Amino acid sequence: QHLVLIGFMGSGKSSLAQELGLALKLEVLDTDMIISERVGLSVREIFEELGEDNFRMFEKNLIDELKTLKTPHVISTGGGIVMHENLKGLGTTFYLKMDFETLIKRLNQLNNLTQAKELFEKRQALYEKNASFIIDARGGLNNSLKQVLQF
């Protein structure tokens, strides 16, 4: 019953979450921002100062915490959130699916993209394992929004 958006950073999750919240009259949460606000450091400062182990532990526990909310929320999530076995059951999960070339274009706001593409294929497989629905993100925000509402 929460509507959880998963996928790569730069796919459009935050913007889609905001629109979804408006369309459905739902409050919107962002897991990276909640963690950042609890610790008082930015996500990058957390990784630098406190280490990824701490970040991942905060993320795992926050997943548990949100499972206790009674009212449905739209939840956007960090790219690594699918590493957690407990993400399953948080809510209905939508993978905002962009092809690699589009995503690299969006992120760009000698072997070069080989490693990026390996990381892409491995993380995409985890997004799909964890998804209730796959949204085709290639048509832009409104087309993604339309899919979610129809689904």
UniProtKB/Swiss-Prot annotation:
<dbReference type="InterPro" id="IPR027417">
    <property type="entry name" value="P-loop_NTPase"/>
</dbReference>
<dbReference type="GO" id="GO:0000287">
    <property type="term" value="F:magnesium ion binding"/>
</dbReference>
<dbReference type="GO" id="GO:0005829">
    <property type="term" value="C:cytosol"/>
</dbReference>
<dbReference type="Pfam" id="PF01202">
    <property type="entry name" value="SKI"/>
</dbReference>
<dbReference type="InterPro" id="IPR031322">
    <property type="entry name" value="Shikimate/glucono_kinase"/>
</dbReference>
<comment type="similarity">
    <text>Belongs to the shikimate kinase family.</text>
</comment>
<dbReference type="InterPro" id="IPR000623">
    <property type="entry name" value="Shikimate_kinase/TSH1"/>
</dbReference>
<keyword id="KW-0547">Nucleotide-binding</keyword>
<keyword id="KW-0460">Magnesium</keyword>
<keyword id="KW-0057">Aromatic amino acid biosynthesis</keyword>
<protein>
    <recommendedName>
        <fullName>Shikimate kinase</fullName>
        <ecNumber>2.7.1.71</ecNumber>
    </recommendedName>
</protein>
<feature type="binding site">
    <location>
        <begin position="10"/>
        <end position="15"/>
    </location>
    <ligand>
        <name>ATP</name>
    </ligand>
</feature>
<dbReference type="InterPro" id="IPR023000">
    <property type="entry name" value="Shikimate_kinase_CS"/>
</dbReference>
<keyword id="KW-0963">Cytoplasm</keyword>
<dbReference type="GO" id="GO:0005524">
    <property type="term" value="F:ATP binding"/>
</dbReference>
<keyword id="KW-0808">Transferase</keyword>
<feature type="binding site">
    <location>
        <position position="32"/>
    </location>
    <ligand>
        <name>substrate</name>
    </ligand>
</feature>
<keyword id="KW-0067">ATP-binding</keyword>
<keyword id="KW-0028">Amino-acid biosynthesis</keyword>
<comment type="subunit">
    <text>Monomer.</text>
</comment>
<keyword id="KW-0479">Metal-binding</keyword>
<comment type="function">
    <text>Catalyzes the specific phosphorylation of the 3-hydroxyl group of shikimic acid using ATP as a cosubstrate.</text>
</comment>
<dbReference type="GO" id="GO:0008652">
    <property type="term" value="P:amino acid biosynthetic process"/>
</dbReference>
<feature type="binding site">
    <location>
        <position position="14"/>
    </location>
    <ligand>
        <name>Mg(2+)</name>
    </ligand>
</feature>
<feature type="binding site">
    <location>
        <position position="79"/>
    </location>
    <ligand>
        <name>substrate</name>
    </ligand>
</feature>
<comment type="pathway">
    <text>Metabolic intermediate biosynthesis; chorismate biosynthesis; chorismate from D-erythrose 4-phosphate and phosphoenolpyruvate: step 5/7.</text>
</comment>
<dbReference type="GO" id="GO:0004765">
    <property type="term" value="F:shikimate kinase activity"/>
</dbReference>
<feature type="binding site">
    <location>
        <position position="123"/>
    </location>
    <ligand>
        <name>substrate</name>
    </ligand>
</feature>
<dbReference type="GO" id="GO:0009423">
    <property type="term" value="P:chorismate biosynthetic process"/>
</dbReference>
<dbReference type="GO" id="GO:0009073">
    <property type="term" value="P:aromatic amino acid family biosynthetic process"/>
</dbReference>
<feature type="binding site">
    <location>
        <position position="56"/>
    </location>
    <ligand>
        <name>substrate</name>
    </ligand>
</feature>
<keyword id="KW-0418">Kinase</keyword>
